[PDB]
Amino acid sequence: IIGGEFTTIENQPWFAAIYRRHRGGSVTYVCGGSLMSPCWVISATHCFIDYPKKEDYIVYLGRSRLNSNTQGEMKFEVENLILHKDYSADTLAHHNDIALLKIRSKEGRCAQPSRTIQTICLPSMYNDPQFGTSCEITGFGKEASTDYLYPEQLKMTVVKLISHRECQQPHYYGSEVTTKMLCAADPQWKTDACQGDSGGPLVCSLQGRMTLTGIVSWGRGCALKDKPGVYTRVSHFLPWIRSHTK
Amino acid sequence: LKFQCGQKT
Ligand SMILES: NC(=[NH2+])c1ccc2[nH]c(-c3cccc(-c4ccccc4)c3[O-])cc2c1
Incomplete structure (x- = not known):
């Protein structure tokens, strides 16, 4: 910004931070997203288009910082990654740039409401x-x-x-x-x-x-x-x- | 408590 x-x-409190894991050990930030319902985050298809392997993405809710932890944050794995069929990019523009990520935590749950996590x-x-x-x-x-x-x-x-x-x-x-x-x-x-x-x-x-x-x-x-x-x-x-x- | 969209606390 x-x-x-x-x-x-x-x-x-609805902001979601999405990162990508690499072989070698680092995880890098990819894009922002928003929590619409307990198990669904919405973002943009161009953020995933070139690397559509859901297993390598991590979603965090409750984060005020990029690489340090925030108390209260929740970490999730991406159960479903839905890109928009008809997404298109040209010089400058991206058409139908919307995507859905269904999240699941290591214990099998979706987001829980707190002062730092809201839809x-x-x-x-x-x-x-x-x-x-x-x-x-x-x-x-x-x-x-x-x-x-x-x-x-x-x-x-x-x-x-x-x-x-x-x-x-x-x-x-x-x-x-x-x-x-x-x-x-x-x-x-x-x-x-x-x-x-x-x-x-x-x-x-x-x-x-x-x-x-x-x-x-x-x-x-x-x-x-x-x-x-x-x-x-x-x-x-x-x-x-x-x-x-x- | 339970989610209430758009409400910050
Ligand atoms: N000026 C703006 N209003 C604006 C807003 C969002 C943007 N995102 C980007 C952007 C640039 C290069 C790569 C990506 C990108 C590509 C793949 C995965 C994640 C991000 C961008 O989102 C530029 C950019 C510019």
Whole structure:
């Protein structure tokens, strides 16, 4: 996250941190995710596409830091990894960039509720907040586009939803942005998501609930003028989510 | 206690 503030997981208790195991001993961070129900985490398909071996991923809930432990964290193995059939990548964009991970702990259980582990709410069919709404994003992604390391502490920032008319202007992203995506930016192009933030949440209050409105997907650069961050429009995937989380 | 989506405590 470029800008933002450092926070703790109690301020984002639905955030899930996904890592990959390597032969040699290290485990590396892959993407962010969100807890929708006790056994299901939602993230982005491009985070797994090039290495779809579920057995090598670890999911942690209740983590405020990247490589150190947090008291209260829960560790899980990925029982089911559901990618989106029709996921597509082109220059810049990712289409249908949403994925589901069914988690199981070594004792065979799903997440348990605590002050550091909570689910986030799903929007209702095709329902979104109006543009201008401020939403927050969180993650362990880069703090500057030129960095080659991720922060150790979790960060968050506030961004505003912009309209598709504004995002599809030729000098922004043109038609690369579709109706199944959402755009969000800072009025002064100061804070934004960046590499390492993929898969995590875009949360806005909708009908009184803090709702999962988007999934961090792509953006040209990070915090660049006229280059908003693009998110998967969760309200348009509710039938798909339902299809596997039933 | 039990999950209540979107509520932070
Ligand atoms: N500017 C933004 N709003 C933005 C948001 C999320 C992003 N994620 C990435 C990204 C870049 C390279 C590789 C991955 C990637 C690929 C495979 C597995 C995990 C991450 C990214 O998510 C860039 C990137 C940029």
